[PDB]
Every structure is written in structure tokens, then in C-alpha cells.
Amino acid sequence: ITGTSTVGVGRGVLGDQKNINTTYSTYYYLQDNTRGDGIFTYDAKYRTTLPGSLWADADNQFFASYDAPAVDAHYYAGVTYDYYKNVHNRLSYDGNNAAIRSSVHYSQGYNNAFWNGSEMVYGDGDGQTFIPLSGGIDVVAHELTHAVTDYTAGLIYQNESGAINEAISDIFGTLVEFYANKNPDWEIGEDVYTPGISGDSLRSMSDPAKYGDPDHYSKRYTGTQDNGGVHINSGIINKAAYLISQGGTHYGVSVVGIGRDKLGKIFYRALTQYLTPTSNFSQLRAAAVQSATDLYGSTSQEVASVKQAFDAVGVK
Ligand SMILES: CC(C)C[C@H]1CCOCCP(=O)([O-])N[C@@H](CC(C)C)C(=O)N1
Ligand SMILES: [Ca+2]
Ligand SMILES: [Ca+2]
Ligand SMILES: [Ca+2]
Ligand SMILES: [Ca+2]
Ligand SMILES: [Zn+2]
């Protein structure tokens, strides 16, 4: 749409009020012209045909409950765009300011979110297992990071490369959650998962085994479900990433933490410069070491922590 840039206000899935960037042209649309070539949010009106209709509102106030998921998907995508640009100097997912699009209210009772190769899609949840998925900033950033990975390393979605792909999405979704300082943690999806139960989450990076995902290479899943366990085995990389950042002793191997910022610089460089579509865990380790080496010196502590972390999860 062509119109005047403005700012509206609404309430997100969790009931919090926020301002969002809109465009005015007869109606007010969820179209943010301030970032790259724009962020656009669409209503899929409970259908599965995408993208659906660009979200239009009559008065620039988004307090209706049907509005919530759109408010959050639109706002969280802007925060995520900000993280990448500010933190890594990357303009949108393709690095050339591509428009970011998301659709909400996809299908009925859909308990998932995904990147379909061209845009983000968020279900509303069935209200027991999940509430609308765009209310979790770590979920929004996990989705946009799949776009980043597809434009860069291109990790194929199966087996070890696919689990690397998935870990990348959880790691940067968590880093964006800390960037925005939105009650950050090392858990995934806590804010929209099982509304009835407090304290849980979908996956844990600090202790993946809490939910049954592997935290050591010897425990990897070798079957065929989930494309070869991309959502299970990512637990091994997530744990490594958490140790690089926070430090700890795991399986008797001690790691000194180097912090989130460095974790992000190292993984971003590995992703954008060294990983390839078919890279495996052992190649991710070489990539991460080389990146840390590039950035801090081969005799640095940084390099040392990256090695210890992988050794601790059993990746040689
Ligand atoms: C949400 C379900 C239980 C877990 C897996 C389902 C398969 O989803 C594939 C697409 P994705 O981008 O990996 N979606 C992720 C959504 C989370 C972060 C809420 C995911 O882990 N989905
Ligand atoms: Ca309105
Ligand atoms: Ca949190
Ligand atoms: Ca989280
Ligand atoms: Ca819960
Ligand atoms: Zn994913």
C-alpha cells in the first residue's frame, strides 16, 4: 500500500500495550515503512491460503482480542529486524532489506509457527497446548532466523544439518529475547506454551534433558521421525551454545562462560561464512572454532571455551 506512515497502539497476546508502526490510506494497515523495504502483517482469517489480506483497521487502535496476535507478530518482527541490523549489521533476512511478511490466525486451533520459504505463519494455538504463537518473541525470532539461515548457510532440513538449522533458530531466538530484555531466559516458547501450567516451556537450552531431548552426542536420536530428529538433536547444540555463554561443568567437562554477545558473534560468523547446506555437527565445531579464532585469536579464551563446550557435549 502507498500512504502516510503513522503510529498506532494496541495490546498483545499477553495483554501488554505497545505502539506499532502503521500506514494510513483510508484504513490504517499493519505495514511498517520504517524498516528496510517494510514489515507487513496479514490476516489469514482461519484459512490456510496465504498470505491472506493485509491487515486493515479503521481507527489505528488495536485492542480487540482478534487483533492481539497481529499486534505481536508485527511488533516482534520489527524488534528482530532491529537486532540483526544493530547487532550484526545485517539488513533483513536476505541482507538486502527484503520485506518481511507474516500471517496470523492461520487455520483453526493450529499449534505451530513456521517459515514457508517466503513468509512467516502463526497459528492461534488450541488454547490448551498453546496460545497464539506470535506472543513469544523467541518464537518470532526463531521463525525469522530460519529465513536468515536459508539465505546464508542453506542448511538442509534433515539429519545433522537440519538439527543445526533448528539450534540456530533457538539460539538467535533466545538472543533476541535477551536483546529486548523481555523476561529473558534460556527456555524456548515459555510465554505461549501451556497457558494452564506455569514454569514449563517447549525446549530448554540450559537443560534439554528436562524434556527429554539429548544433551550429549552419545544420546542422539538416529531414527526417522521429525526429519531425522531436527527438533530433538538440536538439544546437543543448544546445550553447547548455552555452555559457551554461561559456562558450567557438564559430564565432567568444565567450560568457562564468555557471555551472550560473544556467543552471537561467533555463531553468526560461522553461519554466514563457514557453514554449508550439508554441514554436520563435527563441521559446526570446526566452523565455530575458526570463527572464534578469526575474531579473538587462536590462543584466546574464547577459542578455548568453544572447544570445551563441544567436547562437553561429545562433538569431536
Ligand atoms: C511447535 C511444535 C510442538 C514443535 C515443532 C513442530 C514442527 O515445526 C516446524 C516449523 P518450526 O519453525 O521449527 N516451528 C517451531 C515453533 C516453536 C519455536 C514454537 C517448532 O519448534 N516447531
Ligand atoms: Ca481498531
Ligand atoms: Ca522469557
Ligand atoms: Ca524464552
Ligand atoms: Ca506453560
Ligand atoms: Zn524451527
| CB of 112 shorter than 6 A to ligand 1 | yes
| Domain final residue pick, 127, 154, 181 | 154
Q: d(Cα 42, Cα 53) in Å, to the nearest integer?
A: 5
Is the CB of 113 inside a 6 Å radius of any atom of ligand 1? yes
Here the contacts of 291-300 (C-beta below 8 Å, separation 24 or greater) are: 291/265, 291/266, 291/267, 292/266, 294/269, 295/265, 295/266, 295/269, 296/262
Closest to 180 (Cα-Cα) out of 87, 244, 69, 71: 87
Question: How many of the other CB atoms lie within 10 Å of CB of 64?
Answer: 12
**Same domain membership, residue 232 and residue 247:** yes
Q: Which of 74, 231, 250, 302 is catalytic?
A: 231
Structure obtained using:
X-ray
Q: Which residue, by CA, sits nearest to atom 7 of ligand 1?
A: 112
Torsion sign (Cα): 240, 131, 123, 83: negative
The verdict on residue 42 lying in a domain is yes
Last residue of a domain, one of 110, 136, 154: 154
Residue 170 Cβ < 6 Å to ligand 1:
no
Amino acid letter, 316: K
- Residue 200 in marked binding region: yes
Which of 102, 114, 133, when mutated, tests ligand 1's pocket best, judged by the most ligand atoms within 8 Å of its CB?
Answer: 114
The partner residues of 11 in beta bridges, in order of sequence, read 17
How far away, in angstroms, is 29 Cα from ligand 5 center?
32
What HEC string does the chain produce?
CCCEEEEEEEECCCCCEEEEEEEEECEEECEECCCCCCEEEEECCCCCCCCCEECEECCCEECCHHHHHHHHHHHHHHHHHHHHHHHHCCCCCCCCCCCEEEEECCCCCCCCEEECCCCEEECCCCCCCECCHHHCHHHHHHHHHHHHHHHCCCCCCCHHHHHHHHHHHHHHHHHHHHHCCCCCCCEECCCCECCCCCCCCCEECCCHHHHCCCCCHHHCCCCCHHHHHCCCCHHHHHHHHHHHHHCEEECCEEECCCCHHHHHHHHHHHHHHHCCCCCCHHHHHHHHHHHHHHHHCCCCHHHHHHHHHHHHCCCC
At 212, list the grid cell: 527429554
Ligand nearest to the CA of 155: 6
Candidate list 143, 160, 250, 302, residue with the active-site label: 143
From the alpha carbon of 111, which atom of ligand 1 is closest? 1
Nearest CA to ligand 1 atom 18: 139
- Give the length of the chain: 316
181 with 262, same domain: the answer is yes
User: Which ligand is the nearest neighbour of the Cα of 128?
Assistant: 5
Whole-angstrom distance, CA of residue 285 vs CA of residue 271:
12
Ligand 1 neighbour 123 (Cβ under 6 A): no
Instruction: Determine whether the shortest distance from the Cβ of 231 to ligand 1 is under 6 A.
Output: yes
Q: Are residues 59 and 182 in the same domain?
A: no
**149 plus 161 within the same structural domain:** no
Query: What are 222's three cell numbers?
Result: 538416529
Number of domains in the chain: 2
Whether 244 is in a domain gets the answer yes
Range of the domain at 129: 6-154
Residues 91 and 202 in one domain: no
Residue 32 annotated as part of some ligand binding site: no
CATH at 17: 3.10.170.10
How many whole angstroms separate alpha carbon 299 and alpha carbon 316? Answer: 19
- How many Cα atoms occupy the beta-carbon half-sphere of 180 within 13 Å? 22
Entry resolution in angstroms?
1.8
Within a domain: 26: yes
Residue 79 CA, distance from chain mean position:
12
Q: Is residue 1 part of a domain?
A: no
State which ligand 1 atom lies nearest to the alpha carbon of 133: 19
Does the CB atom of residue 202 touch ligand 1 within 6 A? Answer: yes
Distance 184 CA to ligand 4 centre (A): 6
Would you call 231 a catalytic residue per the annotation? yes
Tell me: do 304 and 282 sit in the same domain.
yes
Do 108 and 196 fall into the same domain?
Answer: no
Identify whether 143 is a catalytic site residue.
Answer: yes
